[PDB]
Write a protein that binds this ligand. Structure first.
Ligand code: HEC
Ligand SMILES: [Zn+2]
Ligand SMILES: [Zn+2]
Ligand SMILES: [Zn+2]
Ligand SMILES: [Zn+2]
Length: 118
């Protein structure tokens, strides 16, 4: 629904991830560096080095939104790619102002890169 682009030509997310390209993910992360670092520093968003498997809303000292704090669970690869599909829909009232990664391979490639940034 709606009059914007919605097709995907590269389409089971686990299958997409298993063949992902971490160097391509390293470039997708450029879209997140204004807010997120991979050296443990926190800023507009919390650091994302070691996010894969981390408790949701877990970074010490970072002031998360109410729906993020109340969510529970961990950032598994499925959780991460669901949230990155369209943050504002997937966690209504998130404070992350990012439109999303509609390309399924961009999500899988970005998750594969974050897996190597623990
Ligand atoms: C303009 C800022 C901005 C951009 C760009 C941004 N985030 Fe975020 N991000 C935030 C904020 C703010 C939060 C905290 C959201 C909340 O508390 O609801 C967050 C939370 C996250 C979380 C939850 C972390 C946790 O510790 O619970 C993940 C995962 C995340 N961003 C991933 C990404 C990725 C991957 C990108 C790039 C594709 C990205 N973000 C781009 C601002 C950004
Ligand atoms: Zn950490
Ligand atoms: Zn701690
Ligand atoms: Zn509140
Ligand atoms: Zn949820």
């Amino acid at each position: 629904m709606g009059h914007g682009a919605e097709g995907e030509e590269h389409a089971d997310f686990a299958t997409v991830l298993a063949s992902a390209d971490p160097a391509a993910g390293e470039k997708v992360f450029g879209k997140c560096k204004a807010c997120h670092k991979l050296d443990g520093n926190d800023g507009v968003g919390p650091h994302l080095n070691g996010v894969v498997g981390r408790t949701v809303a877990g970074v010490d000292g970072f002031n998360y939104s109410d729906p993020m704090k109340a969510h529970g669970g961990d950032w598994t690869p499925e959780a991460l790619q669901e949230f990155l599909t369209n943050p504002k829909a997937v966690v209504k009232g998130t404070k992350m102002a990012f439109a999303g990664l509609p390309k399924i391979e961009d999500r899988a490639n970005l998750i594969a890169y974050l897996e190597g940034q623990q």
